[PDB]
Design a protein around this motif. Structure first.
Motif, short mmCIF file in Angstrom:
data_model
loop_
_atom_site.label_atom_id
_atom_site.label_comp_id
_atom_site.label_asym_id
_atom_site.label_seq_id
_atom_site.Cartn_x
_atom_site.Cartn_y
_atom_site.Cartn_z
N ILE A 17 0.82 -1.20 0.00
CA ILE A 17 0.00 0.00 0.00
C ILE A 17 0.86 1.26 0.00
CG2 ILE A 17 -1.93 1.19 1.09
CD1 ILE A 17 -2.62 -1.34 2.54
N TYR A 18 1.56 1.49 1.11
CA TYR A 18 2.42 2.66 1.24
C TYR A 18 3.66 2.52 0.35
CZ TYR A 18 -0.44 2.73 5.46
OH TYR A 18 -1.50 2.69 6.34
N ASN A 19 3.67 3.24 -0.76
CA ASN A 19 4.79 3.21 -1.69
C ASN A 19 5.42 4.59 -1.85
OD1 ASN A 19 2.08 2.20 -3.70
ND2 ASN A 19 2.58 4.34 -3.25
N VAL A 20 4.73 5.61 -1.35
CA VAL A 20 5.21 6.98 -1.43
C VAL A 20 5.49 7.54 -0.04
CG1 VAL A 20 4.08 7.49 -3.61
CG2 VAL A 20 2.86 7.85 -1.46
N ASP A 28 6.65 27.46 10.75
CA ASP A 28 5.44 27.65 11.54
C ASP A 28 4.89 26.30 12.01
OD1 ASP A 28 3.49 29.16 12.80
OD2 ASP A 28 3.11 30.38 11.01
N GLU A 29 5.21 25.25 11.26
CA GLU A 29 4.74 23.91 11.60
C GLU A 29 5.60 22.85 10.93
OE1 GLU A 29 0.79 24.14 10.02
OE2 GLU A 29 1.65 24.62 8.05
N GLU A 30 5.46 21.60 11.38
CA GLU A 30 6.23 20.50 10.83
C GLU A 30 5.53 19.17 11.07
OE1 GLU A 30 10.19 20.20 12.34
OE2 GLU A 30 10.82 18.77 10.80
N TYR A 31 5.28 18.43 9.99
CA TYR A 31 4.61 17.14 10.08
C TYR A 31 4.95 16.26 8.88
CZ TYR A 31 1.38 19.15 6.67
OH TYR A 31 0.84 19.72 5.55
N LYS A 32 4.70 14.96 9.02
CA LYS A 32 4.97 14.01 7.95
C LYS A 32 3.84 13.00 7.82
CE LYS A 32 8.40 14.51 10.37
NZ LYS A 32 8.91 15.91 10.35
N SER A 33 3.41 12.75 6.58
CA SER A 33 2.33 11.80 6.32
C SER A 33 2.25 11.48 4.84
CB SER A 33 1.00 12.37 6.82
OG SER A 33 0.41 13.21 5.84
N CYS A 34 1.91 10.23 4.53
CA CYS A 34 1.79 9.79 3.15
C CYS A 34 1.41 8.31 3.08
CB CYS A 34 3.10 10.02 2.40
SG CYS A 34 2.89 10.74 0.73
N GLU A 39 -3.22 9.33 -2.93
CA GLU A 39 -3.55 10.23 -1.84
C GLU A 39 -2.52 11.35 -1.73
OE1 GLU A 39 -3.90 7.84 1.65
OE2 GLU A 39 -5.98 7.25 1.23
N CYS A 40 -1.24 10.99 -1.85
CA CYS A 40 -0.16 11.96 -1.76
C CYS A 40 -0.27 13.00 -2.87
CB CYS A 40 1.20 11.26 -1.85
SG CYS A 40 2.12 11.24 -0.28
N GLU A 41 -0.69 12.56 -4.05
CA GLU A 41 -0.85 13.46 -5.19
C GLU A 41 -1.91 14.51 -4.92
OE1 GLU A 41 -0.07 12.08 -9.17
OE2 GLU A 41 -2.11 12.64 -9.77
N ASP A 42 -2.81 14.21 -3.99
CA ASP A 42 -3.88 15.14 -3.63
C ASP A 42 -3.32 16.52 -3.31
OD1 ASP A 42 -6.84 14.94 -3.36
OD2 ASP A 42 -6.43 15.78 -1.37
N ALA A 43 -2.09 16.54 -2.79
CA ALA A 43 -1.44 17.80 -2.44
C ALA A 43 -1.12 18.62 -3.68
CB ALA A 43 -0.18 17.53 -1.64
N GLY A 45 -0.20 21.84 -5.99
CA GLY A 45 0.72 22.96 -5.81
C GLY A 45 2.15 22.50 -5.59
N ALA A 46 2.31 21.38 -4.89
CA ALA A 46 3.63 20.84 -4.61
C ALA A 46 3.79 19.45 -5.22
CB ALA A 46 3.88 20.79 -3.11
N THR A 47 5.04 19.06 -5.47
CA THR A 47 5.33 17.76 -6.05
C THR A 47 5.72 16.75 -4.98
OG1 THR A 47 6.59 16.61 -7.79
CG2 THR A 47 7.79 18.18 -6.41
N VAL A 48 5.26 15.51 -5.14
CA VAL A 48 5.55 14.45 -4.18
C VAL A 48 6.62 13.51 -4.72
CG1 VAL A 48 4.63 12.52 -2.87
CG2 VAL A 48 3.21 14.54 -3.27
N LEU A 49 7.75 13.43 -4.02
CA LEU A 49 8.85 12.57 -4.43
C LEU A 49 9.28 11.66 -3.28
CD1 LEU A 49 10.43 13.13 -7.36
CD2 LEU A 49 12.37 13.20 -5.79
#
Length: 57
Positions: A17-20, A28-34, A39-43, A45-49
């Motif tokens: 499942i989790y491949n990205v 101002d903030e800091e977090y990690k999730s994917c 789902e990651c592509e949902d973001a 404006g920014a690119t997911v690598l």
């Protein structure tokens, strides 16, 4: 595969499942999730690598 967590800990990301991975770091903030590129592509404006290694995000 392994991915970083917003709690500062490490999590195991299965290829079934989790491949990205995404890492959000801001002054101002800091977090990690994917998980899935779908789902990651949902973001918009920014690119997911993700890296082939463990704990890249």
């Amino acid at each position: 595969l392994q991915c970083n967590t917003l709690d500062g800990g490490t999590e195991e990301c299965i290829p079934g499942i989790y491949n990205v991975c995404v890492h959000y770091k801001s002054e101002d903030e800091e977090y990690k999730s994917c998980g899935i590129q779908e789902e990651c592509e949902d973001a918009e404006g920014a690119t997911v690598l993700c890296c082939p290694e463990d704990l890249c995000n």
